[PDB]
Amino acid sequence: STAGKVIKCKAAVLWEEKKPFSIEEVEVAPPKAHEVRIKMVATGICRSDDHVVSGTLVTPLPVIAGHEAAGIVESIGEGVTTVRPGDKVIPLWTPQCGKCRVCKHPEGNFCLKNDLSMPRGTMQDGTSRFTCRGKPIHHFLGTSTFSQYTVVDEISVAKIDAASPLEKVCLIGCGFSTGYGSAVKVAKVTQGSTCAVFGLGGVGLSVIMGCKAAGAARIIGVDINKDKFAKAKEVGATECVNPQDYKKPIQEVLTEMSNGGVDFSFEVIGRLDTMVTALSCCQEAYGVSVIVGVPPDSQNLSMNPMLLLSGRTWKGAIFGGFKSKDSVPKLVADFMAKKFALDPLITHVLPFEKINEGFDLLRSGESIRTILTF
Amino acid sequence: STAGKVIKCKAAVLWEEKKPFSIEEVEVAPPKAHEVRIKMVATGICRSDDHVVSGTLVTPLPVIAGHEAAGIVESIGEGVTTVRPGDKVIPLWTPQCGKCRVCKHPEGNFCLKNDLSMPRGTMQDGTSRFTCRGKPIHHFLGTSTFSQYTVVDEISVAKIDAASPLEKVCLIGCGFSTGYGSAVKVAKVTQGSTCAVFGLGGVGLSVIMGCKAAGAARIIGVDINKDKFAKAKEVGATECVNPQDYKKPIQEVLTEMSNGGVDFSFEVIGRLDTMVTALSCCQEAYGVSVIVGVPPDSQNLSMNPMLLLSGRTWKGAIFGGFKSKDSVPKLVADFMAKKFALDPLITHVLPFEKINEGFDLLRSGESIRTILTF
Ligand SMILES: NC(=O)c1ccc[n+]([C@@H]2O[C@H](COP(=O)([O-])OP(=O)(O)OC[C@H]3O[C@@H](n4cnc5c(N)ncnc54)[C@H](O)[C@@H]3O)[C@@H](O)[C@H]2O)c1
Ligand SMILES: NC(=O)c1ccc[n+]([C@@H]2O[C@H](COP(=O)([O-])OP(=O)(O)OC[C@H]3O[C@@H](n4cnc5c(N)ncnc54)[C@H](O)[C@@H]3O)[C@@H](O)[C@H]2O)c1
Ligand SMILES: [Zn+2]
Ligand SMILES: [Zn+2]
Ligand SMILES: [Zn+2]
Ligand SMILES: [Zn+2]
């Protein structure tokens, strides 16, 4: 069979920026020492995958994007001790080497072995496991889930429950855990508080779930797309406001509504203006603002340091603050315990082949989470 | 006796920006309901007082500046209950009304009744108690301590120990409490941590005292005036660096020194660039930066939000996070109990009349804190 041999399969390759994904046949080399080869089962389309296409998030091209997924272990390389063939796993785009200063720190989660800070687009050893048309293709965040088969290092994978519905749980690999963690873990939303969430996509709706789970008394959803409002309220939002409905800036509206400003605000979009607006709408003396959105490559925002001096706290976070490998299996166990619902996030389920169409649904605002089944 | 009558005395009035203080005679109206007239015994020269002169911190002119001091209650208006004539007290440039949103929050201290955000330069009732040359003179942060007598609202005054040495504990009215509370209360410095403090002045040296007390293992002091280093070491600094000695940017130097970044960083200067530099040198996934310095009016800083996305926490604070009315008395009691020392901060003591030379000592970089005696 396939073990130890080169496998040929279909992958969605992005050759150029702003071009559609090309469904190609690629050759996936076998797992080297401390690597694992995975058979993909389901993969969600996250806006960050779209940032690569738009040139917003720069990573070496050509590449096989995709990072929000769930699959099954096909083979493991020499030295692997955390997973074995036939094991259901979720690849980790934010690794957990367990040995750097971040992993050793009780709170940091942005492991130094990550490939997001300075994208090399390769494996930990600096080489690629993908070949298409004889040309080496880059990896994306050490995951590359838009492929029937993918190879990831041991530090970038977690073993999860054997009874896990992989087509639902793949959301824990990004969107959900990110939004949920930003609220309960990072911001530390308090019972009775008033929160504001800018952006009601898959990650934004998950922030709303975190806040509701944390006990927030009031949760204001903000989005320029009013069609997103029903789902927001469905998952926990008390009210939703659309900026274009107002003659005066939204931070002013939010300040008046909350009688001085919100307790916690989240930016879950990726725009420089909304990041400052979110900071501004939280209470000046003790408000917390968390940036969840990924900003456009090489751009600086402008803000008045006085917003901070008065007492506000501004933070940012990757993967919702969770140490990936420790937390991923745990969230799956909690999902299984029926502790939270993922369904409201899944709006479309399409075959992997219909990849470009799932992206078209995102860009147009028709979808929240589209899962691609292989 | 002076009770109920207008008092004519000397005060340093600032008529124009960038101009010397004019020590002259002013009339100090008696205290109205819930106001207190105080005789000033000692007052410190904080850099914020110089910001007014330079126009860095905008407050209506002509004004009687000064906000870090100590004195004795001369008379109380109707309804005053928290202080009585003969009490030693410290004027609070940050009030504690106890009724508003911020006062009732367990963490916040920036009282809504403050005159720092929207400076009117008057009493809580919109009127002034100062007259010079027939012309009304403005108050500053509701304290105006550069006067032999001053009137403050009850919410802006705290009674301290009857045995307190006013010429020393006056620094508790601002410089010390600010720097100290920034480390232990705001940034919450941990045992064994590496800290960096930009600005080795009265407030910065006090930050170092807070880090030492919190157990910091390493505390690097940054200043372009190498003369400040000896006193820094003396109060806690393990090492000191002068950005001018290096060919490469200090955030790089500091990052390499602490093997990937400091745990906590403090900007205690008031410059836009050092605020950004301070954030950048703390560890990217769990570093915490605290802005203590007062920035130039209406000037915005430019920064890359990725600095925060990776996991950094950015916050600022007024008066070290201390609820003024609550904290001040306890801090004076601890001083008495010898829990901390104020002496290393005091480098020059001058009679009030020498106020102008005191400010020149601050500008020449020769002093830390000059106490002015009445
Ligand atoms: N920090 C992390 O670990 C992490 C993880 C996942 C995703 N992200 C980033 O988080 C962001 C959200 O991803 P998502 O998958 O939920 O995206 P999404 O595209 O599904 O949702 C974005 C939403 O924000 C809205 N919006 C756009 N402009 C707006 C504006 N000007 N004002 C108000 N609302 C506006 C859109 O209508 C949309 O509903 C992206 O930038 C993604 O790259 C970060
Ligand atoms: N947030 C608050 O509640 C609060 C309270 C008190 C004072 N402050 C502010 O804190 C700041 C410091 O006050 P201070 O009284 O200690 O002032 P200070 O003038 O005594 O100290 C400033 C120090 O920074 C140094 N410095 C200047 N430029 C530098 C540079 N480019 N790089 C590194 N170091 C540099 C100066 O040499 C000096 O030693 C001020 O801006 C003041 O207004 C804020
Ligand atoms: Zn994602
Ligand atoms: Zn690590
Ligand atoms: Zn001051
Ligand atoms: Zn108050």
Side-chain angles (χ1 to χ4, degrees):
Chain A
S1 285
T2 47
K5 213 177 79 68
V6 160
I7 299 185
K8 272 181 177 64
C9 59
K10 304 200 296 276
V13 188
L14 181 78
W15 296 86
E16 299 177 73
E17 179 183 277
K18 295 182 173 195
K19 293 306 193 188
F21 286 106
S22 191
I23 300 295
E24 314 245 356
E25 181 201 74
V26 298
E27 311 162 63
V28 180
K32 292 187 188 165
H34 299 294
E35 299 182 356
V36 176
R37 191 154 69 179
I38 304 174
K39 189 192 191 308
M40 284 305 132
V41 174
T43 192
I45 299 176
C46 175
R47 179 63 74 159
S48 308
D49 291 304
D50 179 43
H51 291 332
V52 175
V53 187
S54 67
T56 288
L57 177 59
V58 181
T59 205
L61 260 36
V63 57
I64 290 174
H67 64 274
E68 187 178 70
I72 292 181
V73 181
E74 170 264 357
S75 65
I76 62 179
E78 179 184 41
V80 176
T81 60
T82 43
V83 286
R84 268 129 77 181
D87 271 338
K88 292 179 176 190
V89 295
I90 288 181
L92 315 166
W93 56 271
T94 295
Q96 177 170 5
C97 80
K99 300 194 161 188
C100 67
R101 58 178 298 175
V102 190
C103 300
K104 302 228 207 63
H105 190 277
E107 290 163 300
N109 80 319
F110 193 46
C111 172
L112 296 172
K113 293 304 184 201
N114 75 81
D115 197 42
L116 178 66
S117 289
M118 241 174 88
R120 282 202 311 213
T122 62
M123 286 298 273
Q124 285 297 329
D125 71 358
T127 54
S128 170
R129 299 290 164 273
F130 300 120
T131 307
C132 181
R133 303 196 211 206
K135 313 173 72 163
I137 311 299
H138 286 105
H139 288 250
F140 182 60
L141 295 186
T143 51
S144 294
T145 67
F146 286 165
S147 184
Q148 290 173 324
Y149 283 95
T150 193
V151 186
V152 303
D153 302 277
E154 199 180 5
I155 63 170
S156 306
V157 74
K159 178 177 69 257
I160 63 165
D161 195 344
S164 306
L166 298 192
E167 69 280 333
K168 278 161 175 41
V169 300
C170 61
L171 283 175
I172 295 176
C174 187
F176 173 80
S177 308
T178 295
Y180 200 68
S182 294
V184 309
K185 185 88 156 49
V186 183
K188 292 190 187 65
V189 173
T190 63
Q191 184 126 216
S193 56
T194 290
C195 307
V197 184
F198 289 61
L200 303 179
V203 181
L205 296 175
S206 304
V207 172
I208 297 179
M209 299 183 168
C211 297
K212 179 174 186 184
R218 188 151 177 224
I219 313 179
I220 310 167
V222 186
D223 205 306
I224 54 178
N225 175 3
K226 58 188 188 180
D227 290 327
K228 296 297 181 72
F229 297 178
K231 200 128 236 181
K233 292 167 170 171
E234 187 186 312
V235 301
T238 46
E239 54 233 286
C240 294
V241 317
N242 176 352
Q244 15 222 45
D245 282 359
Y246 297 85
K247 283 174 160 73
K248 63 171 159 200
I250 202 54
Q251 48 266 66
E252 269 206 64
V253 177
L254 285 157
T255 302
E256 293 166 28
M257 289 177 65
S258 50
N259 293 320
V262 307
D263 291 285
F264 305 89
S265 73
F266 306 81
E267 197 280 357
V268 202
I269 300 160
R271 290 169 61 87
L272 298 171
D273 55 303
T274 38
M275 283 171 192
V276 186
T277 300
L279 174 60
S280 306
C281 81
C282 70
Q283 217 282 152
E284 58 174 3
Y286 55 78
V288 183
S289 182
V290 183
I291 295 166
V292 180
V294 175
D297 183 64
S298 293
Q299 289 180 229
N300 294 165
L301 56 68
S302 198
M303 60 85 74
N304 182 165
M306 263 297 307
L307 290 178
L308 285 180
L309 240 208
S310 53
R312 281 178 185 93
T313 302
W314 213 359
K315 335 171 85 138
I318 291 292
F319 196 55
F322 292 122
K323 281 175 179 296
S324 64
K325 204 158 171 141
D326 290 327
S327 319
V328 166
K330 213 100 88 293
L331 288 166
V332 163
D334 293 332
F335 168 61
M336 297 282 60
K338 288 183 179 178
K339 293 186 192 176
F340 58 81
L342 292 175
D343 297 304
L345 298 178
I346 293 154
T347 60
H348 297 65
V349 196
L350 308 185
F352 177 60
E353 258 49 284
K354 265 72 185 308
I355 182 174
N356 289 300
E357 190 187 297
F359 270 81
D360 287 323
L361 287 155
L362 183 61
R363 302 177 176 134
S364 67
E366 270 127 47
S367 52
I368 300 287
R369 274 306 200 256
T370 291
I371 307 303
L372 297 167
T373 58
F374 288 82
Chain B
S1 193
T2 42
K5 80 180 297 168
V6 168
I7 288 190
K8 293 190 192 168
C9 63
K10 297 199 153 189
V13 187
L14 186 71
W15 293 105
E16 304 172 84
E17 292 170 37
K18 310 178 188 177
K19 290 298 200 170
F21 286 91
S22 192
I23 307 283
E24 56 191 278
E25 182 173 275
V26 303
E27 302 180 29
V28 182
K32 290 181 185 174
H34 302 289
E35 307 184 359
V36 178
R37 183 153 57 178
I38 314 166
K39 176 170 180 284
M40 221 56 59
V41 177
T43 193
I45 295 175
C46 175
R47 170 68 68 170
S48 303
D49 286 307
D50 182 48
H51 285 337
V52 170
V53 175
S54 55
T56 287
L57 172 72
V58 170
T59 195
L61 262 54
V63 59
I64 285 176
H67 62 290
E68 172 185 280
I72 296 177
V73 176
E74 174 269 323
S75 57
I76 61 169
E78 298 172 284
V80 171
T81 61
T82 62
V83 293
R84 296 179 110 137
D87 286 342
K88 289 192 167 187
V89 292
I90 298 191
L92 311 173
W93 57 271
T94 297
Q96 182 165 0
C97 76
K99 304 160 178 178
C100 80
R101 178 188 165 116
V102 179
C103 291
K104 306 191 72 187
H105 184 261
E107 285 266 81
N109 73 313
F110 197 31
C111 192
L112 292 175
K113 307 271 165 52
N114 76 84
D115 196 44
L116 179 67
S117 22
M118 294 266 212
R120 293 192 293 163
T122 67
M123 295 290 287
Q124 280 301 308
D125 79 351
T127 61
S128 174
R129 298 279 167 288
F130 299 114
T131 314
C132 185
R133 304 188 194 194
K135 311 158 189 166
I137 309 301
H138 284 111
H139 291 244
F140 174 71
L141 300 181
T143 58
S144 295
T145 67
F146 284 168
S147 174
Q148 295 184 330
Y149 283 88
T150 191
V151 183
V152 304
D153 293 274
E154 190 169 28
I155 69 171
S156 306
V157 71
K159 179 190 169 191
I160 61 169
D161 208 282
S164 301
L166 306 183
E167 65 278 351
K168 297 184 188 307
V169 302
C170 62
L171 293 170
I172 287 179
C174 183
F176 176 76
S177 300
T178 287
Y180 195 71
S182 289
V184 310
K185 183 156 203 56
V186 181
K188 294 174 183 307
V189 165
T190 55
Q191 209 185 277
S193 56
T194 284
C195 300
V197 186
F198 288 66
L200 304 180
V203 182
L205 294 185
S206 299
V207 173
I208 291 172
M209 294 191 186
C211 294
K212 190 78 186 260
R218 193 148 176 231
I219 304 178
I220 305 132
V222 190
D223 206 301
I224 50 173
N225 186 359
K226 73 174 201 313
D227 287 339
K228 299 300 181 77
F229 302 168
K231 213 102 185 71
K233 304 271 187 54
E234 188 187 306
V235 291
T238 56
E239 59 225 286
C240 292
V241 311
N242 179 347
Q244 307 178 147
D245 296 331
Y246 305 83
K247 291 184 179 182
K248 68 179 198 172
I250 203 61
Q251 67 279 5
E252 288 187 27
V253 173
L254 284 169
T255 288
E256 179 174 337
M257 273 176 67
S258 58
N259 301 127
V262 306
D263 290 281
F264 306 86
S265 63
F266 302 82
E267 201 282 349
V268 211
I269 305 172
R271 290 174 55 98
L272 299 179
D273 61 323
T274 47
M275 289 184 190
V276 181
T277 299
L279 175 66
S280 310
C281 74
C282 66
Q283 208 285 134
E284 87 182 332
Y286 56 78
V288 177
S289 199
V290 180
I291 293 178
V292 191
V294 175
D297 180 80
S298 302
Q299 297 194 221
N300 286 192
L301 59 65
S302 180
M303 66 77 79
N304 181 184
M306 275 293 309
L307 288 184
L308 297 171
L309 239 228
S310 42
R312 286 184 182 84
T313 296
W314 208 7
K315 51 207 297 167
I318 297 302
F319 203 50
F322 288 119
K323 284 175 175 291
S324 65
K325 192 111 179 185
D326 285 1
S327 311
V328 165
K330 303 177 176 162
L331 284 167
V332 162
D334 294 344
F335 173 69
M336 299 280 74
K338 306 242 302 145
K339 294 306 182 185
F340 60 81
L342 294 177
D343 276 302
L345 300 184
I346 307 164
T347 57
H348 296 80
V349 190
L350 308 171
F352 174 57
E353 297 78 20
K354 296 292 194 63
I355 191 175
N356 280 305
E357 286 106 296
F359 273 91
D360 287 303
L361 280 175
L362 182 56
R363 307 175 177 136
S364 57
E366 284 179 61
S367 60
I368 299 294
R369 276 303 201 264
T370 290
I371 305 306
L372 294 176
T373 54
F374 296 82

